[PDB]
Nucleic acid binder design. Sequence first.
RNA 1: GCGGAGUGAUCUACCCAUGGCCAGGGUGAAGCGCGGGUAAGACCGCGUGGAGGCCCGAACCCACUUAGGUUGAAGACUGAG
RNA 2: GCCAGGCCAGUCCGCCCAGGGUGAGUCGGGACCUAAGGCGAGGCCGACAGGCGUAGUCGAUGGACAACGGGUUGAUAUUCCCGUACCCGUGUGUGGGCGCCCGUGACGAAUCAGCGGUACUAACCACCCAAAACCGGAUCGAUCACUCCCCUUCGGGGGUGUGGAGUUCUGGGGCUGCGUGGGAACUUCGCUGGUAGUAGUCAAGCGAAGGGGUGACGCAGGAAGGUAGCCGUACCAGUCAGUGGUAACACUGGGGCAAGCCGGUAGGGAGAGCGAUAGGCAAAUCCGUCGCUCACUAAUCCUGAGAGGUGACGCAUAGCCGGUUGAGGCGAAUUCGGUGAUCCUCUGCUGCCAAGAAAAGCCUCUAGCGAGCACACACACGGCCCGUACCCCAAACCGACACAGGUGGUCAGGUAGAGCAUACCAAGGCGUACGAGAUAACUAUGGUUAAGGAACUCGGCAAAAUGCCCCCGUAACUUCGGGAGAAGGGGGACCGGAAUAUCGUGAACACCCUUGCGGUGGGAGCGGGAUCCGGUCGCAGAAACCAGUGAGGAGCGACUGUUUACUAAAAACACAGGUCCGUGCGAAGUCGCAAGACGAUGUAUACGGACUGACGCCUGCCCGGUGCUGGAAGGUUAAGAGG
RNA 3: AAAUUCCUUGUCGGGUAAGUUCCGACCUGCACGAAUGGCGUAACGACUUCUCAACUGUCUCAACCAUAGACUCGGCGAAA
RNA 4: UCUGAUCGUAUUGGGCAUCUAACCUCGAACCCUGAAUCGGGUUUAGGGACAGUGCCUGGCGGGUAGUUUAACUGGGGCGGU
RNA 5: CAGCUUGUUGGUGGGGUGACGGCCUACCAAGGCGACGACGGGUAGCCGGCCUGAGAGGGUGUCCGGCCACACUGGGACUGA
RNA 6: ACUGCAGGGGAGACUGGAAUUCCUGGUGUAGCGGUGGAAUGCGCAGAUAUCAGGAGGAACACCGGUGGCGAAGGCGGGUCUCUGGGCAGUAACUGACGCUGAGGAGCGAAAGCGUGGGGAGCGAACAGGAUUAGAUACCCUGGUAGUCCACGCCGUAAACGGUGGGUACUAGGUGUGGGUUUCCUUCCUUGGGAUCCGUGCCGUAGCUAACGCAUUAAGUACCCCGCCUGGGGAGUACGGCC
RNA 7: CGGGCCUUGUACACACCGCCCGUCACGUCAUGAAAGUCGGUAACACCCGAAGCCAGUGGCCUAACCCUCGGGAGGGAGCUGUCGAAGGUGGGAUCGGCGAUUGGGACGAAGUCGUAACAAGGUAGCCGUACCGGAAGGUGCGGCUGGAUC
RNA 8: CGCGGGGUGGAGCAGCCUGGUAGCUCGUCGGGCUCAUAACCCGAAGGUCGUCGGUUCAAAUCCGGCCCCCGCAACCA
RNA 9: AACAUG
Length: 272
Amino acid sequence: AIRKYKPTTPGRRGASVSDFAEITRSTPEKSLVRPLHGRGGRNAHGRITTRHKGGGHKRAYRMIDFRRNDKDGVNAKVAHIEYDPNRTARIALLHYLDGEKRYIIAPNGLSQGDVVESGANADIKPGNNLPLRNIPAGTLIHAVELRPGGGAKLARSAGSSIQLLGKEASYASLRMPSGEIRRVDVRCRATVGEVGNAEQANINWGKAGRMRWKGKRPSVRGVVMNPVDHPHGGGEGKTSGGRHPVSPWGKPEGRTRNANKSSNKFIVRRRR
RNA sequence: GCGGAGUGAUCUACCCAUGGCCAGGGUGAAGCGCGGGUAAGACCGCGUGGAGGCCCGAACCCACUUAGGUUGAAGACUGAG
RNA sequence: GCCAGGCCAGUCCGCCCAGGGUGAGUCGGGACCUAAGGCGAGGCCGACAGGCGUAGUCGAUGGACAACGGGUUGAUAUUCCCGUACCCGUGUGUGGGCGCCCGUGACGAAUCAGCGGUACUAACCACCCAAAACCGGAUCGAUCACUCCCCUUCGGGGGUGUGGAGUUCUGGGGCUGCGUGGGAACUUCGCUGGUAGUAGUCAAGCGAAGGGGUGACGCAGGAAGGUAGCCGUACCAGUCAGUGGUAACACUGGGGCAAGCCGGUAGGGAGAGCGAUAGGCAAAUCCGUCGCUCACUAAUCCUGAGAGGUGACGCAUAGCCGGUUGAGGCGAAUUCGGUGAUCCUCUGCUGCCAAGAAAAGCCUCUAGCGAGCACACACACGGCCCGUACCCCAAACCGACACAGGUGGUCAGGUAGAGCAUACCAAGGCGUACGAGAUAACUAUGGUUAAGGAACUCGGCAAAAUGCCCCCGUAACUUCGGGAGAAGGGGGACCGGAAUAUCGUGAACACCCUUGCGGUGGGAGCGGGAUCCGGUCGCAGAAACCAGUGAGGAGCGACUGUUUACUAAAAACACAGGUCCGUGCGAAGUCGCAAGACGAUGUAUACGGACUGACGCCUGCCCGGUGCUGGAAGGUUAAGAGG
RNA sequence: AAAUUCCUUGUCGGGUAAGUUCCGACCUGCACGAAUGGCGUAACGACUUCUCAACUGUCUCAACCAUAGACUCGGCGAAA
RNA sequence: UCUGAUCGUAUUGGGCAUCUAACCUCGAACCCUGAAUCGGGUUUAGGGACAGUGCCUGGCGGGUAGUUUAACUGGGGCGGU
RNA sequence: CAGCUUGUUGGUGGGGUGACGGCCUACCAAGGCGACGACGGGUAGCCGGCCUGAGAGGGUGUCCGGCCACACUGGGACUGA
RNA sequence: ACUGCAGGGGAGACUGGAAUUCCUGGUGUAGCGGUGGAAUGCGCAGAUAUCAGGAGGAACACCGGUGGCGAAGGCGGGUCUCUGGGCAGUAACUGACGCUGAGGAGCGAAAGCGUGGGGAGCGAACAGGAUUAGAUACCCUGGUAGUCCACGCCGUAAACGGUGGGUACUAGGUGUGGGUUUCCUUCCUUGGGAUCCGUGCCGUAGCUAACGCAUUAAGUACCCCGCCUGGGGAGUACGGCC
RNA sequence: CGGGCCUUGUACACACCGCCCGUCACGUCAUGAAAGUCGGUAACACCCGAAGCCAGUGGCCUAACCCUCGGGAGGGAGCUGUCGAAGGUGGGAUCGGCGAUUGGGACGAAGUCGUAACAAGGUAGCCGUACCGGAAGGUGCGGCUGGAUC
RNA sequence: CGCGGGGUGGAGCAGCCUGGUAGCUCGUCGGGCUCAUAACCCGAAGGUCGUCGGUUCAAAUCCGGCCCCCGCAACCA
RNA sequence: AACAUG
Ligand SMILES: [Mg+2]
Ligand SMILES: [Mg+2]
Ligand SMILES: [Mg+2]
Ligand SMILES: [Mg+2]
Ligand SMILES: [Mg+2]
Ligand SMILES: [Mg+2]
Ligand SMILES: [Mg+2]
Ligand SMILES: [Mg+2]
Ligand SMILES: [Mg+2]
Ligand SMILES: [Mg+2]
Ligand SMILES: [Mg+2]
Ligand SMILES: [Mg+2]
Ligand SMILES: [Mg+2]
Ligand SMILES: [Mg+2]
Ligand SMILES: [Mg+2]
Ligand SMILES: [Mg+2]
Ligand SMILES: [Mg+2]
Ligand SMILES: [Mg+2]
Ligand SMILES: [Mg+2]
Ligand SMILES: [Mg+2]
Ligand SMILES: [Mg+2]
Ligand SMILES: [Mg+2]
Ligand SMILES: [Mg+2]
Ligand SMILES: [Mg+2]
Ligand SMILES: [Mg+2]
Ligand SMILES: [Mg+2]
Ligand SMILES: [Mg+2]
Ligand SMILES: [Mg+2]
Ligand SMILES: [Mg+2]
Ligand SMILES: [Mg+2]
Ligand SMILES: [Mg+2]
Ligand SMILES: [Mg+2]
Ligand SMILES: [Mg+2]
Ligand SMILES: [Mg+2]
Ligand SMILES: [Mg+2]
Ligand SMILES: [Mg+2]
Ligand SMILES: [Mg+2]
Ligand SMILES: [Mg+2]
Ligand SMILES: [Mg+2]
Ligand SMILES: [Mg+2]
Ligand SMILES: [Mg+2]
Ligand SMILES: [Mg+2]
Ligand SMILES: [Mg+2]
Ligand SMILES: [Mg+2]
Ligand SMILES: [Mg+2]
Ligand SMILES: [Mg+2]
Ligand SMILES: [Mg+2]
Ligand SMILES: [Mg+2]
Ligand SMILES: [Mg+2]
Ligand SMILES: [Mg+2]
Ligand SMILES: [Mg+2]
Ligand SMILES: [Mg+2]
Ligand SMILES: [Mg+2]
Ligand SMILES: [Mg+2]
Ligand SMILES: [Mg+2]
Ligand SMILES: [Mg+2]
Ligand SMILES: [Mg+2]
Ligand SMILES: [Mg+2]
Ligand SMILES: [Mg+2]
Ligand SMILES: [Mg+2]
Ligand SMILES: [Mg+2]
Ligand SMILES: [Mg+2]
Ligand SMILES: [Mg+2]
Ligand SMILES: [Mg+2]
Ligand SMILES: [Mg+2]
Ligand SMILES: [Mg+2]
Ligand SMILES: [Mg+2]
Ligand SMILES: [Mg+2]
Ligand SMILES: [Mg+2]
Ligand SMILES: [Mg+2]
Ligand SMILES: [Mg+2]
Ligand SMILES: [Mg+2]
Ligand SMILES: [Mg+2]
Ligand SMILES: [Mg+2]
Ligand SMILES: [Mg+2]
Ligand SMILES: [Mg+2]
Ligand SMILES: [Mg+2]
Ligand SMILES: [Mg+2]
Ligand SMILES: [Mg+2]
Ligand SMILES: [Mg+2]
Ligand SMILES: [Mg+2]
Ligand SMILES: [Mg+2]
Ligand SMILES: [Mg+2]
Ligand SMILES: [Mg+2]
Ligand SMILES: [Mg+2]
Ligand SMILES: [Mg+2]
Ligand SMILES: [Mg+2]
Ligand SMILES: [Mg+2]
Ligand SMILES: [Mg+2]
Ligand SMILES: [Mg+2]
Ligand SMILES: [Mg+2]
Ligand SMILES: [Mg+2]
Ligand SMILES: [Mg+2]
Ligand SMILES: [Mg+2]
Ligand SMILES: [Mg+2]
Ligand SMILES: [Mg+2]
Ligand SMILES: [Mg+2]
Ligand SMILES: [Mg+2]
Ligand SMILES: [Mg+2]
Ligand SMILES: [Mg+2]
Ligand SMILES: [Mg+2]
Ligand SMILES: [Mg+2]
Ligand SMILES: [Mg+2]
Ligand SMILES: [Mg+2]
Ligand SMILES: [Mg+2]
Ligand SMILES: [Mg+2]
Ligand SMILES: [Mg+2]
Ligand SMILES: [Mg+2]
Ligand SMILES: [Mg+2]
Ligand SMILES: [Mg+2]
Ligand SMILES: [Mg+2]
Ligand SMILES: [Mg+2]
Ligand SMILES: [Mg+2]
Ligand SMILES: [Mg+2]
Ligand SMILES: [Mg+2]
Ligand SMILES: [Mg+2]
Ligand SMILES: [Mg+2]
Ligand SMILES: [Mg+2]
Ligand SMILES: [Mg+2]
Ligand SMILES: [Mg+2]
Ligand SMILES: [Mg+2]
Ligand SMILES: [Mg+2]
Ligand SMILES: [Mg+2]
Ligand SMILES: [Mg+2]
Ligand SMILES: [Mg+2]
Ligand SMILES: [Mg+2]
Ligand SMILES: [Mg+2]
């Protein structure tokens, strides 16, 4: 579902786009929309804390239900599959039988009109949300919460999933999408399946301005700066940087995780 | 030139929110039709459509060449491109 | 007014002096609303100073919200005046209505009373578990008692039958207890006469706390329908411009008028009832969801440019008289076409991905309030605050100057033209502040040049050249799009004929009709576009102005793009694509002493760093040096302990 | 023999009447080299470089014309 | 009384495991609260003597700061002294 | 050598020739040819015959006889049966 | 067409056990590994061995053969779902509807290519060790692409039976795969006979230069297609197509 | 180490002291590529166009016929146009020659360096394909017997 | 020209600031092995330590002079 | 292990 353009212009030579074949109803649901504004990388002090940000198209926030705690047994119906500019997945509008509208991340294979269950008595179908205690092992899940009642945090980009390895007593072993083996509580909730829109990694954005539309502002290498600007700056022709490679703030490469962070008791294995 | 305490982003650099502007001419992407061709197709020829950091060109934004200016009309500009 | 100032003079002036002059329910703002951002009660944080921030409160460049045409002054006018509207509020009448107090209109249970569900499960029964002990076949080894038999150093085995304490398979009790499972009282509910058509609820209006709907949003591209504007013309009022012609349609002027209201056209838009309702912080008749029935093909309803009506028995106007040529008075005709927007229908329609503010306001629901309300006509009233003069592509603003510079938006007519380019002109403005002369060199800005044609020079620098429209025709290479307007050619004016339906645009008179802002033919008048043949003219028909030079070979960077404001626009930077490294979530990273923030309302197909820079084919060897990652056997080593 | 080659105008071929620049090779790489990427590449460039047609006051070699100055008169009137 | 082993008593210290009450939580709910994604309180779910922080102590540290880097010399540099 | 063809393929009315005919012209139709080799390229005057061969074939076109083409190269008409 | 029958024919989804490797924990102590002989290497920081748990990938012991199926390439763990062909009998139906097929089209082992996954073991390249005059090899220790999957491209093989398809005929003997039918049918014996379709071995006539083929022809014949014309140069250059 | 017999493989037969492969160096012959350069041939488009035919025009010239004796009729020259050879300009097509430098090919004698094939050729060999290497060749993956000698 | 390395048997390298011995590898020579040659095996030989001239009882070694070879420098207008 | 050549 990746349409390739034809090379009519130099900016559309290798370019490609989504086919958008999964989407019904091009407009969002008006009560579930909150406004956003840009920042350009600036914090509350007004200074750039994240470089290469700004420009970008105007956006509105779609309220996603990352909790799904309060409808255990009330079934829902997938009404539409909509575009969300705020993320790489598509979103599914749910019509619960009691009368409430919600958005969730659309799993792989949750076409329009499907019924979605929730709670400890749900079926293992793509889109149902259960506690991890009720999911069997080996099941591909997504949108998993770290603490109980805290909201979905893990594996929720497009195409990503967690494999549930095993449950021993009070803890489930998860394989996160990086190869990380993490141990979390079994009262944590997770949605069955795999996040859809899995072909968007193959999109070739064709031109510089197409990434300026998405909010990515240009990026100057440190080796073509001056030594007052970067530790790699300097030289009379072009260099490699006359030192082992560092950040713009002089920090070397290497492990930046806190070596005695509190969650080391929960990590079985680091990523590969 | 060194320090202490302050003042400045009405210029300029970038970002944020909300507005406005872009004469005219050309080329003719996707798609959708219709005809063909096939067991079905790919594919093929017409239409239609109006894409694009597309083309030509004013306003507008620039500043490549050149001449003039150089106790200037102007502490950075004019003319022709 | 004229002694300063204005690049000269000045009787003039943006200069000097005195007086005067700026009128709003509707225009632009506040008294209405929020965005980015600001401030910020309490608060959290920080030795102090202070940092951030919640409620809240400000903040238009945006949202909502009521006015048009004419006349008037020396100076203001959507503000004054005249005509005609619209919006919010207030009082007083008059008029019926709708309610409270009254009735009424439906709805409407709470006393008590007979069994099932078959609760309760005592119990009996289904099931089978070591199916509490136990009898008993049987299991097994180096225990062990009596007795028959053999050897010896006199301590113990083999042939092991019977049997004690028993491992084992189970013949077998298998009652119970241990279980679930149908399964009585106690106790409790579904119904039925019944306290019962009984108390009670609701039945004017207002609700703005709150709920819900709406408000409410991108970009590109039209098409169809109109309209303004413009150009002609019926008709109207005038002209004779001392020249060869021209006495009237030959020429010149006119051929006007808004908001509002009426109207509902073209075009757009929507199925409607009734019931239930885990949701909307309380409630809901509203919203959401679900269900049935009918409607569906339609009709109806809302919407909606324009036409037409009215506003207009008014106002204006060409012109004619009158004129201290300042005032004044009178005042014609106004029809039908063409062409046509950047405006309107249209916040509509189609397509696209990059997925496109909030809040008031408005409508609706209920909580709540509530005995008097709602409404029509008439008359009489209130409608506050600030801005308004003037200049505003400039001599009044920013550049020290009346400075060739800079300054956002709206209006934008004619002939030619594709055009808001260009040339000439209208309406309207201006000749802008030193002049007058004079054929010196020389300098600047334009123009032309015989023969030659890059011989010039670091270099074709500059100049010249090409240039439009329609029709032919077009190479290597290529990523199949391009290259390409490649290259290289031909035609082009005027007059007449084809030519009255030649052709194509719109479509009047009258025929015809389901009676209307209708349809069908019908074809006048008005403009548009080429083509063919014939003729005529010049040196030249793209006519002036305007208006691509082309082709070939290398390097570098793929490309469009950015950059040293003021000597460097590039081969530098950026880029899409690549790879490595970090990061498991108030993540890493950054800003802060911290709190807090950003990253991101994101979650490894994500985010940050580094290097390489579309694409094609590729990217070899070295881990000794130095970093990075992991390890911890050995050596050495801090404070503390020990003393 | 390179945006890299000092020696150096290396040598050979092409282009010119004549070519220290240009294109094609050679390898003797002072001092090339694979993501400070290696070698190619259609399209594109106010980029650098060499050649051709056309075209001309760039030149052989200048000559004339008009305007703004310079120049005379009157007025005002500085500067380093 | 010695080296080696073992054991008792008393004292001191390190591992290892569990606990909950310090402390911790941007996990959840309720109240202050009329309007509150702030804050505080209350209860619950977790974590837990770990972490964080004070004092002391070792490492690393062009990230930042202040500085030094000689003279002679047929100019200085380079060489030599 | 795989797409050739616009008087090209057919019709009508005229013209033309000794004669039929796109032979020419105007108009109308949209055909015609091709893998049974179109359109290109290479070579060649064709034949009665001659040479060879058992024949079938293969090679050849010289004398003589037939027909064709040309007359320095290219183009054109005149006269005349 | 009907009635039966045999089959690793194909595609999709799910799924099973053994072994290899790795990870975690226990026990354990100094070697393991490898070869003709060694060395590199691994280990003493607790390897190899051994037991329990876990993750992951690839191939499917026995059945299994000389056998089956498919046009060829090819095809064997299980189950389910979708699907193609063949054989035999009946003779119900159609009435020569056939055979071959230049061009063309489709399929087509392995290696390789593109994008995206996955990666146990194996293993080009590469690196070290050995051997040797050398050793860019064979042997040993490691080890990247690749081998796997999804979707496309490639279109070649000693793609072979070195044997193009169709048809008819021309002694038998002898195994084996699938049917059908006959006498004592149970003479249990699943035996012999007949017949149809395969797949092997022997063997007559005939053919062949010989080896050999021989009812599955390389025999006797007819129809159609592909190909050959001494060896090199060369399946190369040039042109075109992909 | 040498011999004898039977059997098996062979690319050996003056017979393994056999046969034989590919780089490298030297010589000759023919051939491919190449910046560029020199030719030939047949067309195409446009510009210009002689002769001549045809179509017009014909103010000037003209014996035959007609006449009203003026002339008329008909003709000719000249001129205009369509077509038109040769020439000019342009962009392609196509067939040859030369070309610094470079790719292989064949053959030369007593050259240099290995030993890949033929025997189990000393690691069975060949085929397709990939990567690598002075060179024959090596290794992987699949395949064939045209090998497997116990 | 400066600076600092180097010259050792036929070739390529040690030995030198550690003054008293000149070494390894290939090669050359003689003998094996083989039908013959390579490879292999045994046994030998071969050097003024670039030249000269000092120091020392004594020099490859230490110190000067030359003659060669190699590397790095030779910059600012 | 081992082994080239004429
Ligand atoms: Mg601030
Ligand atoms: Mg970034
Ligand atoms: Mg720089
Ligand atoms: Mg620094
Ligand atoms: Mg640099
Ligand atoms: Mg450099
Ligand atoms: Mg200061
Ligand atoms: Mg400030
Ligand atoms: Mg600013
Ligand atoms: Mg500011
Ligand atoms: Mg356009
Ligand atoms: Mg199309
Ligand atoms: Mg553009
Ligand atoms: Mg404009
Ligand atoms: Mg200048
Ligand atoms: Mg300009
Ligand atoms: Mg004065
Ligand atoms: Mg004055
Ligand atoms: Mg305070
Ligand atoms: Mg604050
Ligand atoms: Mg605020
Ligand atoms: Mg306000
Ligand atoms: Mg505003
Ligand atoms: Mg005024
Ligand atoms: Mg009024
Ligand atoms: Mg919105
Ligand atoms: Mg007159
Ligand atoms: Mg509703
Ligand atoms: Mg009207
Ligand atoms: Mg229109
Ligand atoms: Mg839309
Ligand atoms: Mg005014
Ligand atoms: Mg000023
Ligand atoms: Mg000015
Ligand atoms: Mg501007
Ligand atoms: Mg105009
Ligand atoms: Mg203009
Ligand atoms: Mg002026
Ligand atoms: Mg003059
Ligand atoms: Mg001239
Ligand atoms: Mg001339
Ligand atoms: Mg010329
Ligand atoms: Mg020239
Ligand atoms: Mg010159
Ligand atoms: Mg010169
Ligand atoms: Mg120029
Ligand atoms: Mg010019
Ligand atoms: Mg080009
Ligand atoms: Mg052109
Ligand atoms: Mg004409
Ligand atoms: Mg003329
Ligand atoms: Mg560039
Ligand atoms: Mg451009
Ligand atoms: Mg700039
Ligand atoms: Mg500059
Ligand atoms: Mg510049
Ligand atoms: Mg952080
Ligand atoms: Mg990563
Ligand atoms: Mg890096
Ligand atoms: Mg770069
Ligand atoms: Mg990048
Ligand atoms: Mg190491
Ligand atoms: Mg370390
Ligand atoms: Mg040279
Ligand atoms: Mg060059
Ligand atoms: Mg060159
Ligand atoms: Mg180097
Ligand atoms: Mg590398
Ligand atoms: Mg590199
Ligand atoms: Mg590069
Ligand atoms: Mg550019
Ligand atoms: Mg000169
Ligand atoms: Mg004077
Ligand atoms: Mg450091
Ligand atoms: Mg420093
Ligand atoms: Mg100091
Ligand atoms: Mg000094
Ligand atoms: Mg000196
Ligand atoms: Mg014709
Ligand atoms: Mg005729
Ligand atoms: Mg005819
Ligand atoms: Mg001939
Ligand atoms: Mg014969
Ligand atoms: Mg003859
Ligand atoms: Mg003759
Ligand atoms: Mg002759
Ligand atoms: Mg004749
Ligand atoms: Mg099967
Ligand atoms: Mg296993
Ligand atoms: Mg593993
Ligand atoms: Mg083990
Ligand atoms: Mg299977
Ligand atoms: Mg019949
Ligand atoms: Mg066939
Ligand atoms: Mg074929
Ligand atoms: Mg295929
Ligand atoms: Mg494969
Ligand atoms: Mg692959
Ligand atoms: Mg891959
Ligand atoms: Mg090796
Ligand atoms: Mg190996
Ligand atoms: Mg590859
Ligand atoms: Mg598959
Ligand atoms: Mg095969
Ligand atoms: Mg074959
Ligand atoms: Mg046959
Ligand atoms: Mg058979
Ligand atoms: Mg046989
Ligand atoms: Mg034969
Ligand atoms: Mg041959
Ligand atoms: Mg080939
Ligand atoms: Mg070829
Ligand atoms: Mg014998
Ligand atoms: Mg033999
Ligand atoms: Mg031999
Ligand atoms: Mg040779
Ligand atoms: Mg050639
Ligand atoms: Mg003529
Ligand atoms: Mg040559
Ligand atoms: Mg061999
Ligand atoms: Mg071999
Ligand atoms: Mg060997
Ligand atoms: Mg071999
Ligand atoms: Mg190898
Ligand atoms: Mg191979
Ligand atoms: Mg093999
Ligand atoms: Mg010897």
